[PDB]
Amino acid sequence: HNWEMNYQEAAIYLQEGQNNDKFFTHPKDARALAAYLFVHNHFFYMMELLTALLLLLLSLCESPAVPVLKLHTYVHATLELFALMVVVFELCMKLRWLGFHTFVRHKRTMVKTSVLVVQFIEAIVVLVRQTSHVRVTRALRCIFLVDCRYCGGVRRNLRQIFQSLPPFMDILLLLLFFMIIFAILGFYLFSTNPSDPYFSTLENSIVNLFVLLTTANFPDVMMPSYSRNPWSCVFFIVYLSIELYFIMNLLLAVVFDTFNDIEKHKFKSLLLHKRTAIQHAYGLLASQRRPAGISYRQFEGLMRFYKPRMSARERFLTFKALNQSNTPLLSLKDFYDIYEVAALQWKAKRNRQHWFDELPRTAFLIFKGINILVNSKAFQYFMYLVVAVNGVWILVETFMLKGGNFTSKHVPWSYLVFLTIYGVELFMKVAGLGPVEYLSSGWNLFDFSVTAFAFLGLLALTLNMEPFYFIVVLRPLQLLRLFKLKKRYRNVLDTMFELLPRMASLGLTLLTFYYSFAIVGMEFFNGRLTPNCCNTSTVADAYRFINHTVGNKTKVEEGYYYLNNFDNILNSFVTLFELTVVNNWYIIMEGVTSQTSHWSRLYFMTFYIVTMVVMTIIVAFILEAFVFRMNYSRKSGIVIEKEMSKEELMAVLELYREERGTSSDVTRLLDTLSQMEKYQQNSMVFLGRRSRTKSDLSLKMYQEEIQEWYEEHAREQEQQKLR
């Protein structure tokens, strides 16, 4: 009962190194062991995520409501109380695992408890008083989704944005200084003209030069001055040159470069925190004998507690992939690579087909015939020729019918001809190659998806479900097969499906900024923007709704900007998307400040600066990884190839018979005894594979400075171990 506890403890060191969890709270007794095992399941993590996500989606039914998803007050009050009681349960369990003095000194959980208390109080107050009072405190509910376990990549990306901020504030102050001094000069220089609303007072000049900084009103702010004297253009050319190009691009460059340094040091601390965890494990399950290493028995002991649900054959394969020195041990120089070998799935190599050992003759020659045709290199060039003729046919047919062919109910017979060609090619390729060897490649999956989508649209249209005619409209997506002919598109699309979870983990951070601004925007600008209001401002042309009664036609004209409300969480989300895309944001701004005070100008200006810093950091960081991996693809997942013999299995099998483990492991090794006998051979070659994570790109980016990190790390450990 000793070595199994060493195995459990060493697997805890590896999980605790993976999840970036501090080594002071490593469990020693059985009480802290059971608490650690109670918290770190996948049930508890999914309970955190479902509770937090239900709370954010509970904001969809509260007091500014989508009118069909509206509940009464006591219903969503008690749902809010129930979800907060689940959060109390989770903080009690983490308080059970960690100590009290470790719990209090961790700042994120303490802020989470204070937000928990305030949300609990106003939930009870809304439950008693029967009416929702203000509810601005909802905007702090992003901390329940950030502080979970699956959203670590969101939490770190927010923290590094707020840590990139002190170089931003300095040059921002340099920006606002020149903006004010050109507002003073502009007020003196252009206010005597009675024919402009722009430079009339001081706040009109300061607001209009802040909007001109975003270039949202550039010709319109210059024209009443440019009509009087044509030398008034010098003011705006000098202003845009100094302020926009030089200073604002200097601002974004400085913020992004401190963001890269902060990420580089965060990745450094993550590698070094993994490395000490491996060193504690090797300290725990070494031999302490005349050889210094790890035997196969202890490595079996790691893999039966770290990464369970794993075959004994796969376990032996990972051991031989870690050996690398051909002695029956593991040194630290070869045990420093657990995380990148224990994460790969092992497959055998079989050269037979999946339709030949089952059927007899005279269809055996058929499936041989289809395999020869589908792997002939003339069938491929023929199919590219079919795609090219299809595209030229579509283009000439749009020049014939003047683009009017995309409105009729009548399916062209040419569409039926090409759909039969891609269909027959789909059956011949999926049968002559095998459906396992068909869904392997991504392009075959794309062609199957598009062609089966077009059969669905064709069948639904002959079923007279006319809203499914847009599938018939999307014909030229079949021309997207033609892009694998060029090399650079293969690089772009492979990198696009490699960097996809990282892009989702950054879009979620941008959605957190939208969520807090949308809740403040709902509770203060709820019922202001109506049709045909704001007629005392300069934006009366845009909030208008005029009927006419010529004939019996009741033709209406309207300016449509009364639809950018803050009535719901959904109308406010599409409004904040219209403010991220920078154009015409001053119209929504000055409509709201026509109805409310001027401090709502302060709202929209703050949202502009926040969304611009966040958007440049997200786009630049993703595209730096994107360009690096394309150029690396022109410098040259990963595939390892190892093998075993039957002589290397005689040592393995009697150990499982002697130690008396489970039964499925033993019978698995009996099955590979049979598979060695059927082919009449001893040495059998296996094949390992795993998909690229973001840490592999981060190792290839910073490759020239990693050994320096490990040397400085070992020196720091010698400072602690000499003391």
Added chain:
Amino acid sequence: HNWEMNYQEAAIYLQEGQNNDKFFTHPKDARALAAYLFVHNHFFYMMELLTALLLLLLSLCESPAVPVLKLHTYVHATLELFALMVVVFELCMKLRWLGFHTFVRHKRTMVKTSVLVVQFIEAIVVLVRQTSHVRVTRALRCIFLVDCRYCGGVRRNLRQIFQSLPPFMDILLLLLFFMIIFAILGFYLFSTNPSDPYFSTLENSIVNLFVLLTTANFPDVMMPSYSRNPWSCVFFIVYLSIELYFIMNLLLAVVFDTFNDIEKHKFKSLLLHKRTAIQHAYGLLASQRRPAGISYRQFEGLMRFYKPRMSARERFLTFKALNQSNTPLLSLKDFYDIYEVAALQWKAKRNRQHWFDELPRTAFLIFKGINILVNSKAFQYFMYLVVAVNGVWILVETFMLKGGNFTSKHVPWSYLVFLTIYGVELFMKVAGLGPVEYLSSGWNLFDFSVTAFAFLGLLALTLNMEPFYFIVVLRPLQLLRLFKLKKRYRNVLDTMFELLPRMASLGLTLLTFYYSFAIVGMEFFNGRLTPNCCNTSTVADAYRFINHTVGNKTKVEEGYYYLNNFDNILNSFVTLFELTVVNNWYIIMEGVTSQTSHWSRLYFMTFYIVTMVVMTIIVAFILEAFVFRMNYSRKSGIVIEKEMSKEELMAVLELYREERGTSSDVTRLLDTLSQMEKYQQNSMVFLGRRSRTKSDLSLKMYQEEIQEWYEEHAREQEQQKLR
């Protein structure tokens, strides 16, 4: 007469290495020597620049004319003929220096000759027919300003933009594909509504989605669809996410990264071309004796032909700065650094003041008193306190008079008080420190400039020149002294005045693109945009001019976009500046295509793509140098310090007395004999200094990969010298 020709030839090798000129055309005979000396003066270079710049400014008087600078047809025809005859003179002289077979095989001069012939022909045709016909061929006159000698940094920056182009065209084709396929889907999906002009035909959908790619009409193109069904926002969110953010930022990232690689290889070829020039010079004027090096006599021979107008004292100082091994020779390892030592100016070190050896007592104690006060560290903190009180006074005074104080004729007496403080501080600092030691620093130059500017505005206002009141309006530029208190602003402003010629050399390339587009735009869209036209389009609201006659006021309302003409070269320059700043470009586009055909849509789309690639490359390249030199300034011109003794001057003086050179050199060395005797010392310490060029930043950027370049270069030379 032998060694002087070796000196002349070696100085030609160093000039030919500096100017990036090929070594096949090195002159051998006296004929090619006199031709090389006739071409490479500073008179010939300034003749090239003045001819080309007069030709581009001759386009200001031609047939679309600024109406006050308008000439007749024969006057500017003969000016065009005279300037082209000067260009014929220059090509005849370069044909005199280079061979014929070298002249023909150089592509830039051959294109320059063909443009010379065509411009010569249509100049004669305009001179005969008395009316200007079309004159689109003017747009190729940028090649006369690019192909000169002072505009090498413009020529290289244009060439690398056109060499960055094949990765651009590929992803641009990927952009236009998804734009068309969403135009087909959008035409099907939103055309049945009678209340929108956007998706009505096919060309309206393709044009409006190309404009939506620039985000110039984003809310307005969505709103008539978003009013019908609110789920129509999914189309535009998916379109902007895939097309704008991902693909367009991928486009700009790929173009900028190939631009950096092209610049890296161009800088590599420039260093290696300098290095072979130094190797030819060391081959030419070595000893060929028992020591292998360069004596002082031959190094005097270089400096009397390379870098003339140089003292013999400065010549000896550069030799001792090149020695670095304390033997009377120069090896190649210390002669590889000519260009960075021969470019620095040498000064002595003197600790006396400039107002003490002239005046007697009782004012000697006065100027001592002002020096002690101006260097006291309490006078400085006092002056910062004066600036801070001045700024708080300005802010509170704008809150008092509601910003209305910037309109009155009355000068505030507070302005007179602070102006007397800065004036007295200016005289006390410029007298207590010395005007040579006052104009050294940049901030003192700034404070002198601002304060003397304010005396000029005050004196002109008491002279009742009321248009000089804007100097009184620009009070808060005196608050810009307060920014040297923080470290990061000192870094930003020092880097801004270091990277300034490079920024001018990139703005000139952007002006060449404006020039060619402005000439095509003048000759095809001359008299189209009038007041109150284009009333059949959707932009009738913007080209309008309506009078009213209420009372006797004749108040007018107008839409002002008829002022963005193409009538002149100046109206077209401010119009193209309004198209670089992206906002509201489709209004100018659809006004022009209301008057002309649809191929002018093809004009404005091409100009958008060109100006976007050029603007991102310019901004990103400058800001990469900017951030690198700020972070390098937190890692740690250049200053060298060498000395000589009188014993080291006894060797120098008798060589100039024996060889019998000039007289001013000998008398200069007699003057430093006197300056050594007056202080009663032998060793005297001198001080060298030069300002940072762009090649020093380029050496510090690529520092980790330069020795690899020199090794590969030496291997290439051994491949040629073994054969």
